[PDB]
Structures are given as C-alpha cells and as structure tokens.
Design a protein around this ligand. Structure first.
Ligand SMILES: Nc1ncnc2c1ncn2[C@@H]1O[C@H](CSCCCNC(=O)[C@H]2Cc3ccccc3CN2)[C@@H](O)[C@H]1O
Ligand SMILES: Nc1ncnc2c1ncn2[C@@H]1O[C@H](CSCCCNC(=O)[C@H]2Cc3ccccc3CN2)[C@@H](O)[C@H]1O
Lengths: 255, 264
C-alpha cells in the first residue's frame, strides 16, 4: 500500500502552497516549526544522538533539533524516500527546495542565524539514512549502524499513518520507545482525527486519534508528557488531499 | 562645476550589473558573516528605525542607484517612498525590480536578512511586497543642483525623511562639493526631519564595469562637520572598518560610515 507512495506528490500536497505557505503565521507549517523551536530553546532536550523515525522525504522536522545533537540518524520504510532525502543531503539535482522552511526556522529561533548556515549544519550532522519498520520490535534490526540507545527521538506523522487501529499505534510506539535511553526525549507530531491521506496513486489508511488518546498512549509506553498541544486545521487548509482535523505536538520524557 | 562635468561624464560608463556584482554579490554580499558589511549596514538601518523616532508619511531615497536594500527597514515606517537616480539605466534596473521581472537583480537574501534582524517574524515575500507598494515614483535627480529634483517635481515636499547610501561622496570631486550637495538635499527635508546617510570612508575610487570613478576620500570628522554646517544635530555616527578579506580591488575603501542626523 505504501508501495505506491509518491514522495513528490506527498511533498506537493503537504509542503507546497497552501499548506506550505509559510507567510501566514496562523498556518500549520509555522505552528509546527514553532513547537519544535520553543521546545529545543528550553535547553532540556540535549545530547549527542538523535533519531528521526519515518522521516519520509522531509527535513523540516530537524531544523531546530540539529544545533543540539551532533549525530543524527534519519530513517524511512521506503527506498524512494531515503533517496529523496539523500538527494537533498548531498545537494544533488532535483532535490526538494526546503529553503523557506530553513528561513522560517531561523526567523523563529531569533539568534540571527542565516538559513544557509542552518542547512549546512543539518547536512553535516546527519550521518546516515537507514531503513526502519516500526512494526518490528527491533525497528532498525540488530546490525544497526546507529548509536543506541539514542538521546532523543523525533517523529512526525508516522505512527498514526502506519497503524490500522489504536492498538497497533500503541505497539508501534512501544517499539520505537526501545531505541531511546531512559530520561531521553521523544518529540512527536501527528495528525488528529484523520482517516486517510493521498500520495499520488497511493491512498493510505490512517487511524483517527484524539489528543486524549495520544496522551494515554504515551503514558502506557512509559513516558511523562512534558507538553502536548493541538492545532485545529482551518477551512482554507482543507484541500482534498486528506481529512485531517488538526495536528498534535507532543514532548515526552522516558521515566 | 568643471568638477561636476567630469562626474557626469564618468558616470556615462556606469554599468549597474557590474556595480551590483562588485558590491552586492559575494564576498561583499555575503550575509552569513555577521561581521561583514552587508549585515552591518542592515543592522544600522534596522536599529535606527526600531527606535520609532524616525517616521512619517514621506521618504526620499537620494541616489538609489540600482539598489533597494537601503529601504527594507524603512518601508514599514513610511507610506510614500520616492526613489531617485541620475542615470536612466539605474532607474530602469529599479523598474525591472518593481515589475518583479526575472532577470531583475535578486534582493531576496537582503530582504530575508532584514526580516531576521527586525525580529517581527515577517517573511521576505511580504517585505518586498510592501516595498514595491510604497515606492510611488522613481525620479531623475542631480544633487549638484540647488533644486536636485528640478522645479515642478512630482515629489511631495518637503519630505519627512531622507535616506542616502554611497551617493554624495561618490559624485563629489571635493569636500566643498560634498558640503554643497548636502545643503542641496537638505532643502528637500522638513525641519525636525531625519537623514540616514551611509557612505564610504577614505575612498578615492571604485569600479562599475568599464567605469573607474573618482571620488572624494572623506573621514568621519569631515562627515560630522558637514552635517553640523548643514544644520543637523548628529544623533548617531558609526564606523565600520573594512576587513582585508573584503578588500577585493573593486575600490580602495577603508571603512563605511552610518550617520543618523536630524534637521534643526
Ligand atoms: N512500517 C513503517 N515503519 C516506519 N515508517 C513507515 C512504515 N510504513 C510507512 N512508513 C513511512 O511513514 C512516512 C509517513 S509520511 C506522513 C503522512 C501523514 N499524512 C497526513 O495527511 C498528515 C501530513 C501533514 C503534514 C504536515 C501538515 C499537515 C499534515 C496533515 N496530515 C512515510 O514516509 C512512510 O514511508
Ligand atoms: N549628480 C548626481 N546626483 C545624484 N546622484 C548621482 C549623481 N551622479 C551620479 N549619481 C548616482 O550616484 C550613485 C552612486 S552608487 C555607487 C557608489 C558606491 N561606492 C562604493 O565604494 C561602495 C562601497 C560599499 C562598501 C560596502 C558595502 C556597500 C558598498 C556600496 N558602494 C549612482 O547610482 C549614480 O548614478
């Protein structure tokens, strides 16, 4: 099913206008970047190693993260996404243009940083791009190039999007939780009350979750929820590429 | 007056794109190095406008050339902007940019960096859009004339504020000429009005393609005395010393000054 997933279609649907229009601050893109930026600016999420779970073809979710972790592992289930990443990490031709997201991240963080430096830094600190399957109790396998356990995890729009129901969502969460050291941090972004989205020829089933469900799922996996918030999807961002109602952002800490 | 006939003649070889490349592309156009001159200039303008002490309806940019960066912070504070230059080829380059033509020089790195410094979370596309909207006219100017815009000028006079970057010292064969050109533009500004003046220190030449232009070297002391003689109180006068890495053979500039002055 994910076997028909078109990276460029997905990027077009979610990271080009209107949803990728970062000029309005009331949009979902600026909201997400702000969540991430505010969270790292507290100083409490730090360490040497970080893993991004189910990164798809996207990088925005590490823009703020990358100044606090010197070893970054990105991951996805699909080769075609791994290679779309690689195209961007290696500044190859036909890479997706993330420059506006980098620019807005610089603007939000407020340190005077130029966006080319931020990209440079992200590209430098991402050492590897590995396969992953969160449906496995060892999402990475055993012969894993990745430093384990990790100091922090980031995951945006993966678990709900690869899980037919709540229970599989819970298990997938337990599975990635093993990659993270005790005391470590999980940064989790996702769709609320969504049941499908499109990516070219692919129509993906999603489990609709509520904020309450996400919270309880986090507790039951062994986390303290340091923060959990919601963005309600305005009407002009309801575009026929999915049925998302809102987006959640969770900051959680392993006990 | 002979001196200014030489200036006019010399400018007839002025090539915008060469001038842009020399001064507003890398390494001088490198906005990543905060210790660079581009950021220093944007910071001077941002910090001055962020006091709120400089505001009004009308602003005039004196000797804009083919450049736009010097209005990026200002345009949030003035609803009517006049841009000006001696050369048609520069005025046309402005035209291209006003029309959002591809093939126009790209000021997006400057617009972004200005957005970054001002700290209001503005995106650069909106900044540019606002600038294009607030620029109400692009006019011939000659600062050596007692009426630099001419007699029945379109321009709303007197203006609430003037900006001038790298003009007066670049078109004046000597200090006395510099002084008079200053007095001339000062007639365009209302009393109580503000002048933001950026310029080269101790430079005697720069290159604009074919053209190698003679300019009067001035010091900070000279700039300050001239402002005083023209009837200004100096609120701020800052100096940037050009690092060796930015001394590239496009001019013999030693530093840059930023002056904020208010007309008595
Ligand atoms: N078994 C698996 N293990 C790990 N990862 C897997 C996997 N199967 C598929 N994946 C990957 O998960 C990524 C999911 S991309 C996320 C799509 C979520 N769908 C949406 O409709 C969101 C996306 C979105 C994004 C930004 C702002 C708003 C919205 C609205 N809702 C893809 O790259 C797969 O290869
Ligand atoms: N008679 C006249 N009245 C008014 N404007 C006139 C004029 N004759 C010529 N102009 C215009 O003056 C402008 C002068 S622009 C160039 C002068 C700059 N010299 C420099 O050396 C560098 C130096 C520098 C250094 C660091 C960062 C930026 C810069 C920018 N300029 C041109 O557009 C003329 O058409």
């Amino acid at each position: 099913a994910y076997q028909r997933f078109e990276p460029r279609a997905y990027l077009r649907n979610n990271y080009a206008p209107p949803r990728g229009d970062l000029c309005n601050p009331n949009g979902v893109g600026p909201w997400k970047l702000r969540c991430l930026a505010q969270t790292f600016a507290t100083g409490e999420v730090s360490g040497r190693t970080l893993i991004d779970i189910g990164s798809g073809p996207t990088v925005y979710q590490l823009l703020s993260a990358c100044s606090h972790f010197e070893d970054i592992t990105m991951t996805d289930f699909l080769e075609v996404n791994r290679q779309e990443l690689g195209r961007w990490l290696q500044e190859e031709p036909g890479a997706f243009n993330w420059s506006m997201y980098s620019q807005h991240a610089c603007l939000i963080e407020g340190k005077g940083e130029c966006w080319q430096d931020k990209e440079r830094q992200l590209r430098a600190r991402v050492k590897r791009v590995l396969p992953i399957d969160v449906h496995q109790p060892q999402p990475l396998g055993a012969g894993s190039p990745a430093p384990l356990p990790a100091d922090a995890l980031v995951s945006a729009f993966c678990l709900e999007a690869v899980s037919p129901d709540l229970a599989s969502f819970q298990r997938a969460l337990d599975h990635i939780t093993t990659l993270l050291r005790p005391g470590g941090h999980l940064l989790l972004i996702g769709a609320l009350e969504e049941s499908w989205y499109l990516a070219g020829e692919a129509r993906l089933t999603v489990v609709p979750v509520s904020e309450e469900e996400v919270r309880e799922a986090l507790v039951r996996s062994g986390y303290k929820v340091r923060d959990l918030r919601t963005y309600i999807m305005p009407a002009h961002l309801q575009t026929g590429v999915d049925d998302v109602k809102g987006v959640f952002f969770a900051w959680a800490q392993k006990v």
